[PDB]
Amino acid sequence: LPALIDTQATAETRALYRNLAKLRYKHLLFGHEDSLAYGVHWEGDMDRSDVRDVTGANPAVYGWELGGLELGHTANLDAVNFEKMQHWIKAGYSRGGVITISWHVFNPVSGGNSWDKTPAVHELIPGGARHATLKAYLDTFVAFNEGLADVDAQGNKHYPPIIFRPWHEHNGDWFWWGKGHASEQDYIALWRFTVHYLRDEKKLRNLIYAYSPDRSRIDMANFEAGYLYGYPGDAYVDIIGLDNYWDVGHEANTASADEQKAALTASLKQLVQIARSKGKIAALTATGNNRLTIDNFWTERLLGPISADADASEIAYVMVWRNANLAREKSEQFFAPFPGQATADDFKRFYQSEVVLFEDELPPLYR
Numbered sequence: 001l002p003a004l005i006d007t008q009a010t011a012e013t014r015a016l017y018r019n020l021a022k023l024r025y026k027h028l029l030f031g032h033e034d035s036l037a038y039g040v041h042w043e044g045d046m047d048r049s050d051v052r053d054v055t056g057a058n059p060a061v062y063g064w065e066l067g068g069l070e071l072g073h074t075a076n077l078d079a080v081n082f083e084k085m086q087h088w089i090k091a092g093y094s095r096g097g098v099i100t101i102s103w104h105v106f107n108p109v110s111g112g113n114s115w116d117k118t119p120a121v122h123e124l125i126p127g128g129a130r131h132a133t134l135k136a137y138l139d140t141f142v143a144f145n146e147g148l149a150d151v152d153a154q155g156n157k158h159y160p161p162i163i164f165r166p167w168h169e170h171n172g173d174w175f176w177w178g179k180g181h182a183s184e185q186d187y188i189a190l191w192r193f194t195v196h197y198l199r200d201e202k203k204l205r206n207l208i209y210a211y212s213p214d215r216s217r218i219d220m221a222n223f224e225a226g227y228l229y230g231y232p233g234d235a236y237v238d239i240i241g242l243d244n245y246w247d248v249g250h251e252a253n254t255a256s257a258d259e260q261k262a263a264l265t266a267s268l269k270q271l272v273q274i275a276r277s278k279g280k281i282a283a284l285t286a287t288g289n290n291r292l293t294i295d296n297f298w299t300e301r302l303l304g305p306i307s308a309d310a311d312a313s314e315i316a317y318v319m320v321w322r323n324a325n326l327a328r329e330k331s332e333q334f335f336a337p338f339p340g341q342a343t344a345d346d347f348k349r350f351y352q353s354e355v356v357l358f359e360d361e362l363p364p365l366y367r
């Protein structure tokens, strides 16, 4: 019933969207960022994941990150080599997994990173002095995407579908495309251009577009209004996403565990209600408890509140963030366990849940 904004999307892309729409009622796909690139205690293996090391299975959804690609870097902002990333994307896809991509775009004005709040959006949008830069930036993704293609025996090109999730958490003020640094109208212009350019000018047919405000800057008393701040329109969005680290034990959140559980459920319920009204699909596009310090985090703080409400449960997937390599990054940051980590057994329970799907129990999503 939901239809993609790309009316000409590849058969595999259309199939993915249709199958997510069917599966969402009774199941939840589990995703992990940079899952094959490294783990907390390893890097270099060509086919490994902390998630698999714990459960025996790969995540169903593989998140990847392009920041730095736009600058012609060999590797992204977390030192993930782009060539390796292309191979890892193809490998996951070949096993039936789902691919999603974010993009912490560097600041073109200062040459700083996404957290450099020097204004840039007004300059990047059509009519802006730096509009050529936006095109050049997006062109690098067009090229990256070509490195994902195969050609069949008949000479037809095929690609992994990609859930493309740009310009995320835009209701926050921490990125240069965020509130306080870009007008709402200019953000909308940026979004609409991104879609026109990739879908219409460049004729990419393997993309599903995900919109992803941050829950931590939405007023729960007025959720829909907060959610739709900077919303570019139904003709520009396929997935009604949400980044919510807030209700899952964010260190700055003083709300009680029980209050947080209720808020997580309420946030996903309202997310799903918005998706329903718009004929889209909802998802929890980023979440997790950094360093997994919460007892039974997976069953008690994530799955329980999702499953508590039949609307909230209608999200198609949930993705947790990356397992930063300690030897390399100097500070513990991780959102999935690794063997011996305190929540590993509870993560096995999460995996074992009939509702939750990892790679190993996905139906064929691409037909």
Ligand SMILES: OC[C@H]1O[C@@H](O[C@H]2[C@H](O)[C@H](O)[C@H](O)O[C@@H]2CO)[C@@H](O)[C@@H](O)[C@@H]1O
Residues within 6 Å of the ligand: 065, 077, 078, 104, 169, 243, 245, 286, 321, 322, 333
């Ligand atoms: O991989 C890019 C950076 O991600 C950062 O984590 C954030 C991310 O910016 C976004 O806000 C996400 O949805 O929440 C994540 C966890 O807080 C850090 O991992 C940083 O080290 C990376 O460079």
Ligand code: NA
Residues within 6 Å of the ligand: 350, 351, 352, 353, 354, 355, 356, 357, 358, 361
């Ligand atoms: Na399961």
